[PDB]
Design a protein around this ligand. Structure first.
Ligand SMILES: CC(C)S(=O)(=O)NC[C@H](C)c1ccc(-c2ccc([C@@H](C)CNS(=O)(=O)C(C)C)cc2)cc1
Ligand SMILES: C=C(C)[C@H]1CN[C@H](C(=O)O)[C@H]1CC(=O)O
Ligand SMILES: C=C(C)[C@H]1CN[C@H](C(=O)O)[C@H]1CC(=O)O
Ligand SMILES: C=C(C)[C@H]1CN[C@H](C(=O)O)[C@H]1CC(=O)O
Lengths: 209, 85, 83, 155, 51, 51, 51, 51
């Protein structure tokens, strides 16, 4: 009589503990999950996350004049989308990234992105590689006497490491943001009910004696 | 070896016309054939578009049998449109 | 399910109109160039709002709960036939 | 560069690094490719899991805590006992299940160890010899470098 | 760029991106910094999971 | 590890040559059009024998 | 197509794909069958379990 | 892990995936409408495949 009771209960608790183990495995798989956005292309493939650039400047113009597929599609979306995905200032765009709960992505040059990523509240990050490869430069009127001296100077600074040291000075050094598994918090609760059970055990041990 | 634009266009019209001259009375039927051959001979920036598209359309819509000369003479000055699309 | 029949739409022009053949050739060009496809994707799918799950189910365990209660029922049965 | 200065060639197309010395004599177009001096070594065999890969899916904190919990349960039993064995069973059940699942998430890392993570480390050790080409912009860079690390490396 | 072309300034030093459109009107020195168009989002937080 | 220094390659032309500016604007156009990128990807990665 | 243009045949009935290049030389009836360019591979073996 | 690996893997979905991998070679007929389609194609994916 009691044998089939013990048996049925054992089977029940067996399937339940197995199922719990498996579902927990699924959740830890959820934390193990990678690549929400791994590339520029993914933004082109999904309409859920809005994205945009500055109201003007080289980035917007890059997208406008671009004849290559992905960036073209992105430009179409951006120009057509309402409300406007374009921002007046960089700080406005970043603020929009912070306020949007990750529903808005901001397209900006690697420099500004790295710099803001190194600045508190440190809630923002750069994902994937760069869309294009370009550089800044010192600009001089055509046919000015300053052109060649300035150029040779920039070269000198480059080889001397002055530029590098300068970026490290302004970007990282002053940066406030700083440089696997087995969550302890989750187990803490079962530890708490363990200590509680031992407490009740002491209680019974006392009321008996 | 650049193909320019204008040289390609004038070539296009010229080859189309010269081709259609070979088919008398059937001129309205062979417009697309001669345009195909002309696009082959003069080359095209976009294979689908052809050497001059607007000229082709103009010819197709205008040209009637035996009406070749006047039709072409009217159609050869027309805008070719976008050669890349 | 599938489609009952397979047919298509088309641009219609009066018989013997000068526009007919130009329109036709235009449609073919747009088709091969992928203009039709991209257009359809534009209007239908792209702005489409309707678009795996780590979450709990109370339901999967229900069957085993039923076989448990059944087992306890048989237990009551044996307990009765004994006494 | 020589053929360019002395007019033996009208143009130069090649992986030619832009340097101040060359920019003084010749004209460089805007750079068509970006690069930098970098370090190449032989890829190591996978470091193997080691025994620590077993202590990876369960944090050291959980091990210390489960030991203290174990001895606490032991000293509780030392002084009714049914609920102790039951609570302890539930505890060890949740823990072994969680470990199994987390281990499943963890799998193998199969990541190889890197001997040298940066250029400076080469400067700090004599065990691994290192070098550059007999000539070119890299060697010249090391030669003229006024920076401490690169200076040491060149020496 | 405007101030440079119309001669209200002798030189321009700023994070000015090198573009063909700008290289046609003015002269650019060799690049003193490298960059590229990149994507920025809000970093997710795993903190305070709870019991 | 990372790179020791950051520099680039370039097309070289004699000082005062007529070809210089056309070459430069050509490199810029190729840069924005992605021809350079596609080219590197062609020769370096696309045929890549490792993985 | 050749036989049609040069009059060696009065009609052509076959799985002839409709193309603009062919529509320029010949006349195509409304499509009697629908198709598209598709990909064919070898189906993976279901099971080879062993013990 | 085994059971996961079995179902999780998808060999091919669309032509784009064919464009993205060099492991599985792919081709068409020596002639006909498909080859010509790929040849005249200005669309990115098909262009890449044709190349
Ligand atoms: C000799 C030095 C002054 S330097 O090497 O030119 N500049 C140093 C600085 C760290 C730097 C170094 C390299 C680059 C750089 C950036 C991009 C490229 C390629 C990919 C594109 N060319 S381009 O000139 O930017 C384009 C817009 C046409 C090539 C080189 C940009 C800036
Ligand atoms: C910060 C601004 C407005 C500048 C900086 N570089 C780009 C330029 O040279 O125009 C602009 C940014 C951009 O267009 O994304
Ligand atoms: C291959 C050689 C010798 C060239 C290539 N680039 C550098 C140059 O353009 O000088 C040299 C390499 C180097 O310096 O390591
Ligand atoms: C079977 C052959 C050779 C024909 C059938 N349809 C295409 C045609 O009408 O050209 C050809 C196949 C192809 O090229 O995909």
């Amino acid at each position: 009589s009691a044998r089939i009771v013990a048996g049925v209960w054992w089977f029940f608790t067996l399937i339940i503990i197995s199922s719990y183990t498996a579902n927990l495995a699924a959740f830890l798989g959820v934390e193990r999950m990678v690549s929400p956005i791994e590339s520029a292309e993914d933004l082109s493939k999904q309409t859920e996350i809005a994205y945009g650039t500055l109201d003007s400047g080289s980035t917007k113009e890059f997208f406008r004049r671009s004849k290559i597929a992905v960036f073209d599609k992105m430009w179409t979306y951006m120009r057509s989308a309402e409300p406007s995905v374009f921002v007046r200032t960089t700080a406005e765009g970043v603020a929009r990234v912070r306020k949007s709960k990750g529903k808005y992505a901001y397209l900006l040059e690697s420099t500004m992105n790295e710099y803001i990523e190194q600045r508190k509240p440190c809630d923002t990050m750069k994902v994937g590689g760069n869309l294009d490869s370009k550089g800044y430069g010192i600009a001089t009127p055509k046919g000015s006497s300053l052109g060649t001296p300035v150029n040779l100077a920039v070269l000198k600074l480059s080889e001397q490491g002055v530029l590098d040291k300068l970026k490290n000075k302004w970007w990282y050094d002053k940066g406030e943001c700083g440089a696997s598994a087995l969550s302890l918090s989750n187990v803490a609760g079962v530890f708490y009910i363990l200590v509680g059970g031992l407490g009740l055990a002491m209680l019974v041990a006392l009321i008996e004696f | 070896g650049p193909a320019d634009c204008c040289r390609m266009k004038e070539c296009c019209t010229d080859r189309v016309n010269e081709c259609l001259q070979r088919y008398s009375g059937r001129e309205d039927k062979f417009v697309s054939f001669c345009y195909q051959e002309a696009t082959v001979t003069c080359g095209s920036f976009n294979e689908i578009v052809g050497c001059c598209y607007g000229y082709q359309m103009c010819m197709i819509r205008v040209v009637k049998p035996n009406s070749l000369s006047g039709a072409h003479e009217a159609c050869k000055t027309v805008s070719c449109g976008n050669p890349c699309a | 399910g599938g489609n009952l029949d397979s047919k298509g739409y088309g641009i219609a022009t009066p018989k013997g109109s000068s526009l007919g053949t130009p329109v036709n050739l235009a449609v073919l060009k747009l088709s091969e160039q992928g203009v039709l496809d991209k257009l359809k994707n534009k209007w239908w799918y792209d702005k489409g709002e309707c678009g795996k799950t780590s979450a709990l189910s109370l339901s999967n365990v229900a069957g085993v709960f039923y076989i448990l209660v059944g087992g306890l029922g048989l237990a009551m049965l044996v307990a009765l036939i004994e006494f | 560069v020589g053929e360019l200065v002395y007019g033996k060639a009208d143009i130069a197309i090649a992986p030619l690094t832009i340097t101040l010395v060359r920019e003084e004599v010749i004209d460089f177009s805007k750079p068509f490719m970006s690069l930098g001096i970098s370090i190449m070594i032989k890829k190591p065999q996978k470091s193997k899991p080691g025994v620590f890969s077993f202590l990876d899916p369960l944090a050291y904190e959980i091990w210390m805590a489960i030991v203290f919990a174990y001895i606490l349960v032991s000293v509780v039993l030392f002084l009714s006992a049914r609920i102790v064995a039951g609570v302890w069973w539930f505890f060890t059940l949740i823990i072994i299940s969680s470990y199994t699942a987390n281990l499943a998430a963890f799998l193998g890392v199969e990541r190889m160890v890197s001997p040298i993570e940066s250029a400076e480390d080469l400067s700090k050790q004599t065990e691994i010899a290192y070098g550059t080409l007999d000539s070119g912009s890299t060697k010249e860079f090391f030669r003229r470098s006024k920076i401490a690390v690169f200076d040491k490396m060149w020496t």
